[PDB]
Amino acid sequence: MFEARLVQGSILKKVLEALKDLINEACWDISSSGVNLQSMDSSHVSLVQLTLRSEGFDTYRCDRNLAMGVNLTSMSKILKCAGNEDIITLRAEDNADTLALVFEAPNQEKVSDYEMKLMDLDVEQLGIPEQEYSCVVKMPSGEFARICRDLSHIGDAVVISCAKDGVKFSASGELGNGNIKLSQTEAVTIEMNEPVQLTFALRYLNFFTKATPLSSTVTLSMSADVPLVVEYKIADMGHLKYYLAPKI
Amino acid sequence: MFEARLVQGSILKKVLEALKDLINEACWDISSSGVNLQSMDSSHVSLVQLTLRSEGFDTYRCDRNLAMGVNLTSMSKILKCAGNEDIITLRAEDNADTLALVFEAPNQEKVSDYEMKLMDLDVEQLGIPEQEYSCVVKMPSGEFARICRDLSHIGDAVVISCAKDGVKFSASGELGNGNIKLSQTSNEAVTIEMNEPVQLTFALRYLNFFTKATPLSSTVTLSMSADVPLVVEYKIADMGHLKYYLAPKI
Amino acid sequence: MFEARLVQGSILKKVLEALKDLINEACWDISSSGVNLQSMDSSHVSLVQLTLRSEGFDTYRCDRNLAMGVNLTSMSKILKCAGNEDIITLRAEDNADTLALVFEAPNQEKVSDYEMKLMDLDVEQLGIPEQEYSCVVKMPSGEFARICRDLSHIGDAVVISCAKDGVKFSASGELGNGNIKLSQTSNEAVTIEMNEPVQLTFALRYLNFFTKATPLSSTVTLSMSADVPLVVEYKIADMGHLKYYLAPKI
Amino acid sequence: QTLLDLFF
Numbered sequence: 100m101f102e103a104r105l106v107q108g109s110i111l112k113k114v115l116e117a118l119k120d121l122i123n124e125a126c127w128d129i130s131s132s133g134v135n136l137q138s139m140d141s142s143h144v145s146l147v148q149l150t151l152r153s154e155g156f157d158t159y160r161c162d163r164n165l166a167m168g169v170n171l172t173s174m175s176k177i178l179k180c181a182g183n184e185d186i187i188t189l190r191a192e193d194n195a196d197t198l199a200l201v202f203e204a205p206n207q208e209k210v211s212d213y214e215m216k217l218m219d220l221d222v223e224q225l226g227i228p229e230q231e232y233s234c235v236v237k238m239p240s241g242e243f244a245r246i247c248r249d250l251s252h253i254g255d256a257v258v259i260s261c262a263k264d265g266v267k268f269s270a271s272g273e274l275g276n277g278n279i280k281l282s283q284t285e286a287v288t289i290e291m292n293e294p295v296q297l298t299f300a301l302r303y304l305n306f307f308t309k310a311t312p313l314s315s316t317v318t319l320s321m322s323a324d325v326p327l328v329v330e331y332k333i334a335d336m337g338h339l340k341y342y343l344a345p346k347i
Numbered sequence: 348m349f350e351a352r353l354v355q356g357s358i359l360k361k362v363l364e365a366l367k368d369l370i371n372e373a374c375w376d377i378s379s380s381g382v383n384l385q386s387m388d389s390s391h392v393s394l395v396q397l398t399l400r401s402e403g404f405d406t407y408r409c410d411r412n413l414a415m416g417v418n419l420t421s422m423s424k425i426l427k428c429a430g431n432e433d434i435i436t437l438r439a440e441d442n443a444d445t446l447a448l449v450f451e452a453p454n455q456e457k458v459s460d461y462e463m464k465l466m467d468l469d470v471e472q473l474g475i476p477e478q479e480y481s482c483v484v485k486m487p488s489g490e491f492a493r494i495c496r497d498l499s500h501i502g503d504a505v506v507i508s509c510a511k512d513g514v515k516f517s518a519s520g521e522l523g524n525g526n527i528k529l530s531q532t533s534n535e536a537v538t539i540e541m542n543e544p545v546q547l548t549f550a551l552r553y554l555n556f557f558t559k560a561t562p563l564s565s566t567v568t569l570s571m572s573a574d575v576p577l578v579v580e581y582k583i584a585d586m587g588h589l590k591y592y593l594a595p596k597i
Numbered sequence: 598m599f600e601a602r603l604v605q606g607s608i609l610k611k612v613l614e615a616l617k618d619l620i621n622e623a624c625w626d627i628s629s630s631g632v633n634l635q636s637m638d639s640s641h642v643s644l645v646q647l648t649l650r651s652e653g654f655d656t657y658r659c660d661r662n663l664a665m666g667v668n669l670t671s672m673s674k675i676l677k678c679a680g681n682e683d684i685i686t687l688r689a690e691d692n693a694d695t696l697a698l699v700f701e702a703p704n705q706e707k708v709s710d711y712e713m714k715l716m717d718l719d720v721e722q723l724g725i726p727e728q729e730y731s732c733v734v735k736m737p738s739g740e741f742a743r744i745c746r747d748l749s750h751i752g753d754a755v756v757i758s759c760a761k762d763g764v765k766f767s768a769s770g771e772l773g774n775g776n777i778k779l780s781q782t783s784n785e786a787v788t789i790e791m792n793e794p795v796q797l798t799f800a801l802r803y804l805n806f807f808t809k810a811t812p813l814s815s816t817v818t819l820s821m822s823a824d825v826p827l828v829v830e831y832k833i834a835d836m837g838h839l840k841y842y843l844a845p846k847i
Numbered sequence: 848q849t850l851l852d853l854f855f
Contacts, residue, residue, distance in 0.1 A: 143850040173522040180497035180525065197523065208530050208537065209490065213501075215523035227855055242707070249678035253711070274671045275695065275713035277678065282706055300848060326854050344849040421772045428747035428775065445773065456780055456787060457740070461751075463773040 101191040104158040108187030117310035119175040126222035129165045146342040155336030168220035232320040233293040234261035240317040244308035251301040298346040307341040349439040352406040356435030365560035367423040374470040379409045394592040403586030416466040480570040481543040482509035488567040492558035499551040501525045508546040548596040557591040599689045602656040606685030615810035617673040624720045627663040644842040653836030666718035730820040731793040732759040738817040742808035749801040758796040798846040807841040
């Protein structure tokens with residue numbers, strides 16, 4: 100039996116909205132330490148990693164480790180049936196043939212109870228070696244979303260050049276070209292060991308920014324030749340990290 | 348000659364918005380007692396009944412009873428040309444070739460005059476026996492609309508089980524299933540006047556048409572008995588009501 | 598070398614939104630007096646004329662007169678990348694193969710610069726003789742937009758009858774017909790300066806393009822005489838205007 | 848355009 104109660108149920112609503120466009124199906128690894136999800140998109144160009152720590156929940160119990168296979172579109176649909184101030188409880192029996200989801204409000208007048216079928220997935224897990232990066236940019240999440248949206252109307256790739264004093268985003272296509280310069284100051288801060296210059300597919304960045312409602316800040320971590328990390332903190336709980344392989 | 352002036356013209360805008368998606372054409376039966384409309388949808392699964400009492404209008408005159416045939420899509424389009432605080436006057440001549448609709452504000456800087464062609468329809472009239480129902484649920488209209496919208500992403504049909512203590516809405520489909528339980532409130536009240544339990548199954552596609560009437564009232568009433576159509580009623584304050592009838596499944 | 602700095606950059610965002618649906622391509626005539634644009638739509642039914650005077654910009658400089666050919670859809674897309682409080686600088690060098698556009702805020706945290714390729718266009722200039730009109734109607738721009746939108750669900754043409762005392766808009770189609778009467782106000786004014794009555798018919802499809810200029814001004818002016826094009830004018834405060842010309846029917 | 852298990 101697994102059971103986790105989250106009073107700030109809107110966190111789960113936003114997590115699923117931030118996932119369902121990038122990936123269809125994923126395995127939720129539950130253990131006594133928390134919830135972990137790790138999945139590559141079908142094209143193997145990006146990977147998303149979700150961490151929700153045990154201690155972030157209001158009640159949390161894992162009698163035994165589980166790997167639930169979930170259609171994220173279906174779970175997304177169910178979570179749209181929760182109000183933004185609902186208390187959300189997740190709950191899975193020994194068999195784990197279904198995931199139960201309970202939506203409540205402190206006044207308790209509407210209680211909703213959903214049962215969704217799980218599925219069998221090759222749970223293929225993978226690891227990320229904790230590194231430091233040449234450049235780490237912390238900036239408002241809304242600003243980064245706007246940059247990625249605007250530049251995607253210029254071209255389909257963005258060159259991210261990071262220096263000690265600022266970060267630039269550049270794109271070009273048939274219309275012409277464009278460059279957006281951000282200065283270190285809604286703070287923009289840059290921790291740089293060395294300069295970097297990387298190119299990334301804008302279509303994937305615009306999937307990542309569906310996580311923007313989870314945090315007013317976003318962090319970009321870059322080094323030569325390695326995937327970009329785009330991380331949104333889920334306050335008092337964990338994070339949503341997106342990995343994007345550079346071009347060439 | 349018929350003429351009715353309604354200061355709260357938004358009532359008429361909301362009524363047509365609540366009708367036009369369920370019904371193409373309908374007959375407005377005008378009498379000195381008020382305006383009544385009664386029409387089944389084309390599949391004959393649901394019926395809508397509108398009552399607007401003469402005394403709910405600011406002025407009301409019916410020289411003689413009439414049965415105007417109206418394309419509700421056309422009337423809906425005209426009423427979209429009225430502002431939400433407009434005064435709306437309806438007017439029909441003896442011929443009854445066309446319905447005149449006049450929109451004005453208290454300002455009066457802008458006065459709009461629309462003339463809409465009527466139609467011939469087979470004015471077939473039905474009636475409903477006033478019943479008492481096993482279960483009558485009064486609940487906030489916005490909550491009922493949300494429940495019907497949400498469950499329609501789970502399945503095609505909703506099982507409504509009503510008891511003394513509360514009412515439950517259930518649906519199931521490919522994704523899984525879902526149940527929503529509402530409790531009676533103490534004091535957006537939820538109240539249940541209940542002689543006998545019922546449990547009935549209804550098509551969600553039609554309920555989602557009915558909730559287009561939600562702007563007319565902050566309250567909705569569901570009236571249920573075994574083997575008979577559900578009644579979904581929205582009060583039109585100081586004026587009348589919009590009632591939807593839905594036949595159960597099996 | 599040309600360079601113009603506009604602190605209220607939203608003016609440029611709104612101008613391009615008011616242009617891009619009516620015309621794909623146009624020539625920006627830059628001189629030391631300001632910016633002017635003049636272009637017919639492809640069907641030759643309407644013409645738009647934009648004036649932005651030198652002195653309306655915060656800095657302005659034309660070393661020499663230029664005639665930049667611009668894809669307005671491409672410039673519209675770039676201007677969507679500017680925030681509504683951004684300072685916008687336009688810049689072109691002698692060659693004039695590209696137009697540079699620079700977007701900043703006062704805090705200077707984010708600076709964007711775009712380069713868009715120009716085009717070669719048959720720069721076909723035309724002229725409008727300054728006349729007086731039998732009738733000139735000044736009225737709120739949102740009200741005119743609503744009238745054109747609403748009547749376009751009745752028919753595809755509007756008859757505009759202007760008298761000393763008021764202006765009427767009429768349309769008719771398969772649904773029926775509609776008339777909107779506006780009275781002069783005494784004091785959102787409606788004012789009419791009239792020499793002689795006019796009654797003219799215009800394609801509603803084009804007027805609905807013109808009202809995309811509504812965000813530029815709370816007021817619009819209609820200028821009419823018999824058998825001549827309607828002028829629909831939006832003042833761009835402290836700077837210039839956007840005028841649309843529409844040839845009447847018959 | 849690279850891919851990811853390539854990287855891990």
